[PDB]
Every structure is written in structure tokens, then in C-alpha cells.
Amino acid sequence: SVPSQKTYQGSYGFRLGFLHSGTAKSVTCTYSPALNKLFCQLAKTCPVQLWVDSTPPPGTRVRAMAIYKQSQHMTEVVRRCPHHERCSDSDGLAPPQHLIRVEGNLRAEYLDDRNTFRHSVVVPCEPPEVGSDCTTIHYNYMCYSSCMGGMNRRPILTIITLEDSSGNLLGRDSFEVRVCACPGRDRRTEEENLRK
Numbered sequence: 001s002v003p004s005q006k007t008y009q010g011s012y013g014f015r016l017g018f019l020h021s022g023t024a025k026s027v028t029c030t031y032s033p034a035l036n037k038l039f040c041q042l043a044k045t046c047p048v049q050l051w052v053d054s055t056p057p058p059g060t061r062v063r064a065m066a067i068y069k070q071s072q073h074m075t076e077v078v079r080r081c082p083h084h085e086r087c088s089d090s091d092g093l094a095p096p097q098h099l100i101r102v103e104g105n106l107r108a109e110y111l112d113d114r115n116t117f118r119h120s121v122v123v124p125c126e127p128p129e130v131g132s133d134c135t136t137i138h139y140n141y142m143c144y145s146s147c148m149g150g151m152n153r154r155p156i157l158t159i160i161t162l163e164d165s166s167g168n169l170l171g172r173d174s175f176e177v178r179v180c181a182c183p184g185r186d187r188r189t190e191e192e193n194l195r196k
């Protein structure tokens with residue numbers, strides 16, 4: 001009733017990577033390695049790199065799912081709040097209840113799990129473009145961490161899993177997410193809190 005968050009590189013050496021976007025007041029998405037935490041604005045592009053040591057088979061896929069970070073909330077499905085699920089901002093593919101969307105990939109599939117009711121979005125693995133060493137997925141987070149009746153200030157993790165064509169686990173990585181109005185300031189504040 002709780003998805004695993006154990007980091008697992010697996011046979012292909014799977015792991016995530018993030019850009020170095022800085023902490024200026026204008027930044028829309030920024031990743032803190034010290035906190036393993038992504039800070040982003042509502043519905044803005046979040047580039048997440050996928051890295052492997054060797055090529056996985058055709059039909060391998062990459063799934064993203066959010067869970068609450070605190071154990072006392074982990075069994076609760078992470079979903080959009082009562083306002084955002086009704087705001088008719090559909091892209092034509094993501095269900096309006098889903099917090100995490102994939103941007104710009106018509107092969108993305110959205111799952112409402114028939115047993116756990118959890119939401120996820122999954123895309124086929126594609127090899128890097130010529131001249132690149134990794135592949136990037138562009139995610140969007142569709143509610144603020146503060147949204148009342150939804151995340152309600154509770155921290156979340158995103159779990160990224162590499163899966164075979166039948167959904168079996170090949171690799172796993174994860175990161176905390178805060179969706180907020182000023183990611184650069186919040187990253188600076190939280191890194192300062194950690195240093196102190």
C-alpha cells in the first residue's frame with residue numbers, strides 16, 4: 001500500500017540527473033543536491049535527465065509517481081486539490097486529477113491504478129539524440145505544495161522507475177519536490193537551514 005523509494009541502479013546503471021539552474025529570484029525550476037529536492041513553479045517545465053551505463057531493451061519505459069514523504073501520510077494518494085482538479089487546464093491526455101504530467105510527448109500514458117488508486121505517468125525509453133549522452137523528460141507539477149485540500153503543505157517525493165515492457169522493476173531513483181511561487185528563494189532558505 002506504499003510504493004518503494006529504495007534507490008536501485010539495476011543492471012543498466014539507471015540514475016537521474018538535474019541541470020544547474022541557480023537560485024535567482026526569476027528561476028522557475030531548480031534542484032538542490034544537498035537536499036535531494038527539486039523546487040519548481042506551478043505548471044512549469046522541469047527537465048529530468050535519465051542516465052544509464054548500458055542500453056536497456058526496446059520496450060523499456062520510465063514511470064513517475066508522487067507519494068507523501070512523511071510516513072503518517074504515505075498511504076494517502078497524492079492528487080490535485082479540489083480547485084485544480086476542476087480548473088479545466090487539460091492538455092487532452094492527462095486526467096485532471098493527476099499532479100504529474102509529461103510535457104511534449106504524445107506517447108505518454110497516464111495510469112489510475114485499479115488496486116491502489118495511485119496516479120502515474122509513463123513514457124517509452126528513447127535513446128539520446130545524436131550528440132547527447134542522456135535523455136531528458138520534461139515534467140510539470142500541477143498543484144502547489146500549499147494547496148488546501150490537496151498536498152496541504154505536506155512534502156512529497158517523486159519516484160522514477162525504469163520498467164520492462166510488462167512493468168517489472170529495472171531501476172529506481174527519487175527526489176523530494178516543493179511546488180512553490182519562488183523556487184530560488186526557497187532553495188536558498190532550505191539550504192541555509194540545513195547548513196545551520
Ligand SMILES: O=C(O)c1cc(OCCc2ccccc2)c(-n2cccc2)c(I)c1O
Nearest residue numbers: 050051052055056057058125126127134135
Ligand atoms: O545510450 C543508450 O543507448 C540509451 C538508451 C536508452 O533507452 C533506449 C531504449 C530503446 C532501445 C532500443 C530501441 C528503442 C528504445 C536510454 N534511456 C531512455 C530513458 C531511460 C533510459 C538511455 I538515458 C540511453 O543512454
Ligand SMILES: [Zn+2]
Nearest residue numbers: 081084143147
Ligand atoms: Zn491545487
